[PDB]
């Protein structure tokens, strides 16, 4: 139908032999050793061009290992397309690979790298009058465009216009192939069909992004002030999307909770042109506009938030705009505010489109916010490497190329992120838990080690500890009784299972501004979702919480940012686990996740004054047994 393996084809090319596979002739005199069968490229200390080699591998492929002695090699089709979109000479990379890589360049590996360097799009999508059209630098391109229902049929007969190619680029085709070739100006309407037919017929088109064919008019009411927070991955991600000289929207896969909109506001301001902002849902549009956009330079007086339950100033909104998908297209096209904003969205020519989590909502409506308007740019601030909108015509080839990807090592390390500490306390074993472990093999042991009163104790130590430090504590406990039993055991104004949001907010106000309550317990109701509170000391008790894609989410979600630097590890992550219980397998599953995420992690089982804390309630194995009987009820 419309699915492309090439975007998500990463994850292969690691299999070789020893009989057929010979030691690379460069192996004697080769700084690297390109294991072509295993797809691994170990960049040892002997490579003089290791920095030059390291960058080239990161483009065409993904370096899985970055060890001190030697690195590791992995194959990524998006990297292959990205390394193909990198622009490095396919032959030149291979030979410096071949000369550097002692393992001879694999025959399959050599073909892919050249296939990267030239393929990853050999399409011929021509452009006329600084715009996008149905043409091609190559001949098979003009045939694809002319015989295209959207490219050709949606293409106006005019070969090119300075204003029409300027304005219309049958939407905005600011992602087309090589222009200045034979083509015809396309209309102002519907590049979904352009992409939905290059979809059906598998036209990998060698695409560009012509960023001042992101011109789109006299200049909007944009306040070109950089007072919005700037921190280093965003700027070099911007430097990637700002490219050479002027603002190009690419695809820049960015996280929601680390200043994602910040690159978009800058690129919107930088073009000094009409821009719309699209977030997931209208309620998030306000949340996003609330929690940053007034800290940001943005004056929301211009940004009409729209729900079509939320009528606002369409077609009169002087500056930039923030609307949302279900508005901008859906079955939730549900008051003529929605359509009229969209009527205004088509009416006003828009330079740039900031997009937030397009993947959750079907691309078809995005293809419908890509069916009607024909802006100049978009901006895909995607959140996952593989998305349900990874159709064979990817949303990458409609907004701008990849400038920012799974290689989140170049950018965030430039100084954005702070230090986050993680820890995993082994709560001591007590006969009943094991007798409880013995008796049932079921998952019902879940709270049976969660309840460990010693686990309560270590929590209380952190509580008095972070109260002593004036710090803040997050606890992730989805139990109700043993949590209440523990919240009863602590006795602070406590967020707990189904905490009243006002009491949550009250405790939160008594938690972050007031240091007296320096412990709140977030149950499973925190995600998803609340406006999650700041993370200095995260404790997690429940560890099933599957699947593990969520555990990436929660880890990201629960560990919120902190503007406190009094503590040396301003984001503690803790995990109170009863050692020798059912989730030692699953507690070991969390540890490997965090170290893959790279958060600074440790284990503290030699607690300073473990038994010296207040409220040794239920401390004895008997009462742990008694609470274990208490929790066998749950």
């Amino acid at each position: 139908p419309a699915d492309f393996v090439p975007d998500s084809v990463s994850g292969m090319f690691r299999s070789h032999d020893f009989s057929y596979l010979r030691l690379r002739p460069d192996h004697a005199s080769r700084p690297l050793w390109i294991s072509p069968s295993d797809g691994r490229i170990i960049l040892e200390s002997f490579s003089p061009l290791a920095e030059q080699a390291q960058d080239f591998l990161v483009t065409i492929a993904e370096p899985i290992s970055r060890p001190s002695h030697i690195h590791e090699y992995k194959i990524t089709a998006y990297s292959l397309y990205a390394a193909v979109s990198v622009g490095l000479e396919t032959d030149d990379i291979i030979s410096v690979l071949d000369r550097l890589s002692k393992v001879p360049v694999a025959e399959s590996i050599i073909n892919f790298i050249k296939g990267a360097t030239i393929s990853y799009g050999k399409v011929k999508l021509v452009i006329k009058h600084n715009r996008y059209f149905v043409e091609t630098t190559q001949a098979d391109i003009l045939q694809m465009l002319l015989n295209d229902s959207v490219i050709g049929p949606l293409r106006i007969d005019s070969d090119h216009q300075v204003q029409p190619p300027e304005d219309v680029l049958e939407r905005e085709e600011e992602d087309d192939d090589i222009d200045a070739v034979h083509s015809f100006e396309i209309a102002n309407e519907s590049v979904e069909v352009v992409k939905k037919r290059c979809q059906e017929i598998d036209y990998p088109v060698l695409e560009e992004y012509d960023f001042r064919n992101d011109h789109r008019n006299p200049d909007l009411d944009i306040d070109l002030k950089p007072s919005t927070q700037i921190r280093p991955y965003q700027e070099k991600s911007l430097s990637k999307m700002f490219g050479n000289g002027r603002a190009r929207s690419g695809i820049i896969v960015l996280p929601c909770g680390a200043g994602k909109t910040l690159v978009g506001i800058t690129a919107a301001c930088t073009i000094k042109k009409s821009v719309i902002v699209l977030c997931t849902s209208s309620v998030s549009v306000m949340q996003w506009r609330q929690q940053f956009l007034q800290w940001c330079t943005l004056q929301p007086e211009n940004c009409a938030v729209f729900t079509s339950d939320n009528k606002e100033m369409f077609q009169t909104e002087s500056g930039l705009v923030v609307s949302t998908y279900s508005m901008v297209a859906n079955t939730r096209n549900r008051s003529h505010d929605s359509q009229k904003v969209m009527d205004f969205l088509t009416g006003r020519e828009w330079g740039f489109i900031i997009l937030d989590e397009v993947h959750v909502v079907p691309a078809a409506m995005f293809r419908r916010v890509v069916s009607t308007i024909a802006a100049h740019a978009k901006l895909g601030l995607t959140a996952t490497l593989v998305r349900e909108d990874d159709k064979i015509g990817d949303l990458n080839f409609l907004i701008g190329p990849k400038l920012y990807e799974a290689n989140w090592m170049e950018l965030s390390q430039k100084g954005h992120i702070a230090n986050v500490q993680c820890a995993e306390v082994w709560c001591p074993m007590t006969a009943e838990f094991y007798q409880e472990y013995l008796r049932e093999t079921a998952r019902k042991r879940m709270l049976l080690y969660i309840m460990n009163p010693t686990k309560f104790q270590a929590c209380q130590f952190l509580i008095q500890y972070h109260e002593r430090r004036g710090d803040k504590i997050i606890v992730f406990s989805d139990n109700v009784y043993a949590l209440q039993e523990y919240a009863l055991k602590m006795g602070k104004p406590f967020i707990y299972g189904s905490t009243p949001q006002q009491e949550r907010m009250n405790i939160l106000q008594n938690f972050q501004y007031n240091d007296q309550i320096n412990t709140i317990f977030l149950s499973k109701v925190g995600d998803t979702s609340i406006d999650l509170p700041e993370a200095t000391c995260l404790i997690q008790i429940s560890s099933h919480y599957g699947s593990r894609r969520q555990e990436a989410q929660r880890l990201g979600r629960i560990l919120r940012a902190k503007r406190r630097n009094d503590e040396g590890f301003n984001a503690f992550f803790y995990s109170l686990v009863s050692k020798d219980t059912q989730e030692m397998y699953y507690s070991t599953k969390r540890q490997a996740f965090l170290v893959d995420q790279g958060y600074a992690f440790k284990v503290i089982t030699h607690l300073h004054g473990m038994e010296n804390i207040p409220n040794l309630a239920y401390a004895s194995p008997r009462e742990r047994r008694e609470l274990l009987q208490e929790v066998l009820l749950k």
Binding site: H16, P67, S68
Partner: protein
């Protein structure tokens, strides 16, 4: 390691002196005694008189006297001397067989078992006759631990391994696998392993026709020097030559071809004690020919290899697909659990990884070393030498496979006042001898280094 030294003292006084009959075995037993014990031997080897202990006590000043107790206790256990409560004092003198056999072997004496070697055209080349002996070890070691091909043909050796339970492998089923003893075989590298096997054969070949002094004279003859000519022919006893030929078959005698020639003094006899350099169709790429992969990511990055070696590596890691340079294997808590299933503690493997797999992990260890010991008091943070992250997972895995604990020493009593217990405890932490204590009980179960020094300080 069984610490074969403890075996020499176990053999009673006479067979020691019987052992001490050959100035070879006089000169031999001398090199293993602690250096304090060495120093007290030779003094009273030559001055033909006994010495009071007060002088020997006054000879050794403060700390280092623990080696003065280390010297004298090992000294008495193997009875190369005779303590003498002559006039209530302590008259220390060699088991005279030691001293003069030493003195003889010192001043060109009658160690004919020592002089049992013969010098001739030493046609044994540096490369010649030990590659068999080195391959002898390689084949049998592949046999004993379990290689892809277990080419160990030593029927006497195989019975000793199964009979001595050297490897926890099913001798009834022919299994040559690493048990607790088999895991210990994977720990004692050259001395300790060369020690461990010498013990199994002695236990195995001890029923009939032992002739231990001749065995020990013959063992100490082949390893003492390159008997060369006339070793396996002349300088060898009947059971000794059978031991020499059996040592010849086991490689430990590199008994030259024809089965009847001088003692083929293979280098194997040398390594059992030397505790020095260890390196032994027509190609043998070394020394770094072996290789493995152990890094922070807990993964094997193998580029150099050796089959029995990677077979040994596979004994605690999965192997999936041997590639051109790499073997598809990844070390995990599951991977070491293959050995913990065998009861193999994550203790000897610690020392194993720091030493073995280095031929590929040279730079990796070298970059880990960083010389962060003189910088250690300077820069208080050592730079990941040796890798601690692996051992904690091993320990936690070992702790996951644990929960039995015990201590050595002896419970102590007659601690009358708190001052002496406080003063004794305070000094104990200065030298580090106290496992656990309590003023309340005035009892602790530790070594006697504390009791010997308070007695010596009080008495002298």
């Amino acid at each position: 390691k069984h610490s074969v030294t403890q075996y020499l003292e176990e053999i009673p006084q006479q067979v020691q002196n019987r052992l001490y009959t050959s100035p070879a075995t006089c000169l031999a037993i001398y090199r293993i005694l602690p250096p304090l014990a060495k120093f007290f031997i030779m003094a009273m080897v030559f001055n033909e008189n006994e010495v009071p202990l007060l002088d020997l006590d006054k000879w050794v000043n403060s700390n280092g006297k623990l080696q003065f107790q280390n010297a004298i206790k090992s000294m008495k256990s193997l009875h190369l001397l005779i303590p003498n409560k002559s006039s209530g004092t302590l008259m220390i003198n060699l088991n005279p067989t030691f001293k003069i056999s030493l003195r003889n072997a010192l001043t060109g004496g009658e160690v004919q078992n020592s002089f049992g070697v013969v010098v001739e055209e030493n046609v044994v080349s540096l490369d010649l006759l030990d590659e068999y002996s080195a391959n002898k070890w390689e084949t049998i070691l592949h046999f004993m631990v379990g290689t892809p091909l277990a080419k160990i043909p030593s029927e006497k050796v195989l019975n000793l391994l199964k009979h001595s339970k050297l490897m926890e492998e099913v001798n009834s089923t022919g299994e040559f696998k690493i048990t607790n003893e088999g895991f210990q075989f994977l720990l004692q590298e050259i001395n300790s392993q060369l020690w461990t096997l010498l013990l199994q054969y002695l236990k195995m070949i001890e029923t009939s026709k032992m002739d231990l002094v001749d065995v020990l004279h013959f063992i100490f003859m082949l390893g003492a020097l390159e008997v060369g000519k006339a070793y396996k022919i002349d300088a060898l006893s009947e059971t000794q030559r059978i031991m020499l030929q059996d040592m010849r078959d086991y490689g430990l005698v590199f008994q030259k071809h024809s089965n009847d020639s001088i003692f083929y003094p293979t280098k194997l006899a040398l390594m059992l004690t030397s505790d020095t350099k260890t390196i032994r169709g027509l190609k043998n790429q070394d020394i770094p020919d072996g290789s493995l992969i152990v890094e922070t990511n807990f993964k094997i990055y193998s580029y150099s290899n050796s089959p029995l070696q990677i077979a040994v590596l596979s004994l605690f890691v999965h192997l999936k697909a041997r590639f051109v340079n790499m073997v598809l294997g990844q070390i995990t808590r599951e991977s070491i659990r293959r050995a913990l299933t065998n009861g193999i503690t994550a203790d000897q493997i610690i020392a194993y990884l720091e030493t073995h797999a280095h031929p590929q992990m040279r730079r990796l260890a070298e970059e880990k070393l960083e010389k962060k010991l003189e910088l250690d008091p300077n820069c208080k943070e050592p730079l990941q030498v040796l890798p601690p992250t692996v051992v904690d997972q091993i320990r936690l895995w070992q702790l996951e496979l644990d929960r039995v604990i015990t201590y050595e020493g002896s419970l102590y009593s007659d601690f009358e006042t708190s001052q002496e217990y406080n003063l004794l405890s305070k000094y104990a932490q200065d030298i580090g001898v106290l496992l656990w204590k309590d003023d309340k009980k005035k009892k602790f179960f530790i070594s006697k280094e504390g009791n010997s020094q308070v007695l010596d300080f009080a008495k002298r």
